C-alpha cells in the first residue's frame, strides 16, 4: 500500500543518513590546512578576442591547446585560433536560443543544442568552406543544457525534462535513457576514463551514472537551490558543483558525501559555470555580477580575482596543457588570461 | 610571409567581413516576448498579428511602418518557467494577455503580473498589457446572475474615475467594472516603479484590429526614453 511504501522510504532514508554519517570522520578543509597557499595570483589579458554581438553562452577548448570555439545568441558559432587571434571558421546556427557546444575528442566534429529539443552535429573536414551539417538527434521534450562526446560515435545529452540519454550517431536512436530525477537538468561531464558520467538538476540532487547499463549508481544531496555547473577532477574520482545561491562544494564519489564548501560572507550573487585546472590546483568560477574568481581547490580561500567585464560571466575553460584560461560574459568579449 | 600567415590573414579578413555585414541585420529587427494563459486568448491576437505579416518554441513575424517585429511564443515546455525566461533579458517589451470575464482566475493573472514585474533580469523591460473579452464581462454584469463583489469586496466603495472616457455609450456599471480591473493592475504597476520601466494598459476585445499599432507606439516611447538617458 501507499502508507507501507512511504514508511519503507522513510526508514531507508534514515538508514542511508546513518550510513553517510558513519564515515564522516574528517573534513577536507581540516586535512589540507597546512598546504602552502598559491599566494597572490594575477593574470593580465594577453589576447582580447572580439567580434560577437550579444550574450555568450558556451565555450569549449579543443583537443589541441591551440584551437577554440565560441557560441553566441546572435546566431553564431565561431571557430577561433588563439595564437594569432584569427577567425578560422564561422557557422550560422539555425536556432538562436542555444545553450551548449563541444568539440569531438579527435577534432573532427562539433555539436550544438538549444531551446528546441534538438542536437545538431557538424563535421569539420569538408570540401566547402562551410562546416556542413550532417546529423540531428531528436527525441527530447524540453530543452537541452549540455552535450559531450565519448568518442566519434557515442555521445551524451542532458535535457530539462528529468532525463539524460546516450546516443549512437550513425543510426540515430537512444541506446539507454537515464531517469530518476525530478526537476530539469543543467550540466554533465564525461569521465576521464570514458566509462561513466555525472549529472545535476534543479533540486538538491546530483547523480553518478554508469553508461552501458543505464542503472544509476549514486545519488548526492546538499544544496539549497538549483545546480548550475559541474565537471570532472582529472583522476575521475571527484567533482565540484556550484549552485544558484552563491555556494560551491566538493565531493568524492567513494565517500558518498560532500567534502568541502566554498563560500564567502559577502557574496549574494550566484554562480554560472565552473572548471578545473590541469594539475588539480586551480578551480575557476564565473559569478553573477561582473567577475570571475580563481580558487585554490584545497583551502576554500580566494587565490585571485579576474575583472574586466561589464555584465555577467557565463563561460570558463582551461587549455589542455596549462597554457591559458578563457572567460566569456554577456558583454560580447572573450578574454584569454595567461 | 610564410604560408601559415597567408592563410591566417585571409581567413580572419573574410570572417571579419561577414560579421561586419551581419551587425546591421542583427540591430535592424526588434524582438518581443509573449506571455498569457491557457484560456487567455494568446492565439487570437497571434492570428490578428499574423494578419499584420514537438518543437520547443514558435516564431511569428510582422512589419509595421517599415520596422520588423519578431514574437517568440513558448510551447512544448514544462510548467516551471524560472530558467528559460532569463534568456529574454534583452528584448524591447512583453505582451501580457489577460481575460476580463472570469473572477476565479483574475487573482492568478494578477500574481503572474506581479511575478514578471519584479524580476531581477527583467527590471528594464516595459509591459504592454491586453485586457480581453470585454463583451463577456458586460453581459455577465448586465445579467446580474453573480456579483463581482462575491470575489472582490471593495467594489462596494468605488466611484468611476473622473478621467474615465466611456465613449461607445455604455451603461455606467460596465465602466465601473472595467476601471476596477484596470486600477487593480495599475496599482501593482505604480507600487514600485522607478522611471526605468512602465506599464501601458489597454482595452480590447476578441474582434479588435488595432493591436500592433499600440505595440508600435509603446515601443517608440520606450526607445525615445532610452536615448534621452544615455546621451543627456
Amino acid at each position: 500500500e501507499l502508507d507501507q511504501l512511504r514508511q519503507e522510504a522513510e526508514q531507508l532514508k534514515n538508514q542511508i543518513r546513518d550510513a553517510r554519517k558513519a564515515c564522516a570522520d574528517a573534513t577536507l578543509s581540516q586535512i589540507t590546512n597546512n598546504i602552502d597557499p598559491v599566494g597572490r595570483i594575477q593574470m593580465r589579458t594577453r589576447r582580447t578576442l572580439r567580434g560577437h554581438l550579444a550574450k555568450i553562452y558556451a565555450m569549449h577548448w579543443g583537443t589541441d591547446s591551440r584551437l577554440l570555439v565560441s557560441a553566441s545568441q546572435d546566431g553564431k558559432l565561431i571557430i577561433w585560433d588563439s595564437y594569432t587571434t584569427n577567425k578560422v571558421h564561422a557557422i550560422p546556427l539555425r536556432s538562436s536560443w542555444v545553450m551548449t557546444c563541444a568539440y569531438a575528442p579527435s577534432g573532427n566534429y562539433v555539436a550544438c543544442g538549444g531551446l528546441d529539443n534538438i542536437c545538431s552535429i557538424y563535421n569539420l573536414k569538408t570540401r566547402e568552406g562551410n562546416v556542413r551539417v550532417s546529423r540531428e538527434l531528436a527525441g527530447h521534450t524540453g530543452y537541452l543544457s549540455c552535450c559531450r562526446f565519448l568518442d566519434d560515435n557515442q555521445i551524451v545529452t542532458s535535457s530539462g525534462d528529468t532525463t539524460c540519454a546516450l546516443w549512437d550517431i550513425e543510426t540515430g536512436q537512444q541506446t539507454t535513457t537515464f531517469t530518476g530525477h525530478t526537476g530539469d537538468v543543467m550540466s554533465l561531464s564525461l569521465a576521464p576514463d570514458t566509462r561513466l558520467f555525472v549529472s545535476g538538476a534543479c533540486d538538491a540532487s546530483a547523480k553518478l551514472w554508469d553508461v552501458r547499463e543505464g542503472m544509476c549508481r549514486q545519488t548526492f544531496t546538499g544544496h539549497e537551490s538549483d545546480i548550475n555547473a559541474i565537471c570532472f577532477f582529472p583522476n575521475g574520482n571527484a567533482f565540484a558543483t556550484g549552485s544558484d545561491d552563491a555556494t560551491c562544494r566538493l565531493f568524492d564519489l567513494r565517500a558518498d558525501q560532500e567534502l568541502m564548501t566554498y563560500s564567502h560572507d559577502n557574496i549574494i550573487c550566484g554562480i554560472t559555470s565552473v572548471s578545473f585546472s590541469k594539475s588539480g590546483r586551480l578551480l575557476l568560477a564565473g559569478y553573477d555580477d561582473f567577475n570571475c574568481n580563481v580558487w585554490d581547490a584545497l583551502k576554500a580561500d580566494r587565490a585571485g580575482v579576474l575583472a574586466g567585464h561589464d555584465n555577467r560571466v557565463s563561460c570558463l575553460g582551461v587549455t589542455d596543457d596549462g597554457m591559458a584560461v578563457a572567460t566569456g560574459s554577456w558583454d560580447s568579449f572573450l578574454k584569454i588570461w595567461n | 610571409l610564410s604560408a601559415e600567415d597567408k592563410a591566417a590573414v585571409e581567413r580572419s579578413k573574410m570572417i571579419e567581413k561577414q560579421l561586419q555585414k551581419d551587425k546591421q541585420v542583427y540591430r535592424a529587427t526588434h524582438r518581443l516576448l509573449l506571455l498569457g494563459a491557457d484560456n487567455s486568448g494568446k492565439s487570437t491576437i497571434v492570428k490578428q498579428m499574423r494578419i499584420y505579416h514537438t518543437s520547443g518554441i514558435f516564431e511569428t513575424k510582422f512589419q509595421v511602418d517599415k520596422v520588423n517585429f519578431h514574437m517568440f511564443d513558448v510551447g512544448a515546455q514544462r510548467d516551471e518557467r524560472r530558467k528559460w525566461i532569463q534568456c529574454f533579458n534583452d528584448v524591447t517589451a512583453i505582451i501580457f494577455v489577460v481575460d476580463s470575464s472570469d473572477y476565479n482566475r483574475l487573482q492568478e493573472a494578477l500574481n503572474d503580473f506581479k511575478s514578471i514585474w519584479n524580476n531581477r533580469w527583467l527590471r528594464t523591460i516595459s509591459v504592454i498589457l491586453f485586457l480581453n473579452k470585454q463583451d463577456l464581462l458586460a453581459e455577465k454584469v448586465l445579467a446580474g446572475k453573480s456579483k463581482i463583489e462575491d470575489y472582490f469586496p471593495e467594489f462596494a466603495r468605488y466611484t468611476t474615475p473622473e478621467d474615465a472616457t466611456p465613449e461607445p455609450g455604455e451603461d455606467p456599471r460596465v465602466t465601473r467594472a472595467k476601471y476596477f480591473i484596470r486600477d487593480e493592475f495599475l496599482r501593482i504597476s505604480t507600487a514600485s516603479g522607478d522611471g526605468r520601466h512602465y506599464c501601458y494598459p489597454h482595452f480590447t476585445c476578441s474582434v479588435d484590429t488595432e493591436n500592433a499599432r499600440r505595440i508600435f507606439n509603446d515601443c517608440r516611447d520606450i526607445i525615445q526614453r532610452m536615448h534621452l538617458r544615455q546621451y543627456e
Epitope: 525530478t182 526537476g183 534543479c202 533540486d203 538538491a204 539549497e224 537551490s225 538549483d226 544558484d244 545561491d245 549574494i268 | 510548467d79 516551471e80 518557467r81 524560472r82 492568478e108 506581479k114 511575478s115 514578471i116 514585474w117 519584479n118 524580476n119 531581477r120
Partner: nanobody, 127 residues
Framework: QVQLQESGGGLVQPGGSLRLSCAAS????????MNWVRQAPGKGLEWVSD????????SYTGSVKGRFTISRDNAKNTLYLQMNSLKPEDTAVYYC?????????????????????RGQGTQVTVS
C-alpha cells in the same frame, strides 16, 4: 534535503475557527519569501496568500479578504494561516510553498503541478 510538513486538518460545520501550520527544514528560513496554496476536490491549484521576507508586507485574496490571517516565524521556521468563520465552499487540502531563489522579491512557479520545494498537504473539510 527539502522538508515541508503541514498540520491542522479536520472536518467542521460552518462557523469554525482553525489554525493551519506548515513547518520547514532544510535551508536558512530567515530570508525566503513564502506562500499558501490550496487544492479543492475536483479543482486545480489556486493561490491563497503571500508574505515577504521580514513581515512588513502582507497580502491576501479577495475571496478571503476579511476572514484569514497570514503570519510567520523566522525563529520557529513556520508559516501560519489563521481562520475564524468558515464556509462549506472551503473544503480543500493546503500546501505551503517556498520561493525558488534567495534574497529576492519575485517568486515563480509555486502553483506548479510538480515542484521541488512544496510540502505534502493538510486536509480541511467544512460541512
Amino acid at each position: 534535503q527539502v522538508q515541508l510538513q503541514e498540520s491542522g486538518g479536520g472536518l467542521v460545520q460552518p462557523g469554525g475557527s482553525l489554525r493551519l501550520s506548515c513547518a520547514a527544514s532544510g535551508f536558512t528560513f530567515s530570508n525566503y519569501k513564502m506562500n499558501w496554496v490550496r487544492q479543492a476536490p475536483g479543482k486545480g491549484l489556486e493561490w491563497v496568500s503571500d508574505i515577504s521576507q521580514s513581515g512588513a508586507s502582507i497580502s491576501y485574496t479577495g475571496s478571503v479578504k476579511g476572514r484569514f490571517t497570514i503570519s510567520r516565524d523566522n525563529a520557529k521556521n513556520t508559516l501560519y494561516l489563521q481562520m475564524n468563520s468558515l464556509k462549506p465552499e472551503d473544503t480543500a487540502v493546503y500546501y505551503c510553498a517556498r520561493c525558488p531563489a534567495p534574497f529576492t522579491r519575485d517568486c515563480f512557479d509555486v502553483t506548479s503541478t510538480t515542484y521541488a520545494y512544496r510540502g505534502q498537504g493538510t486536509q480541511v473539510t467544512v460541512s
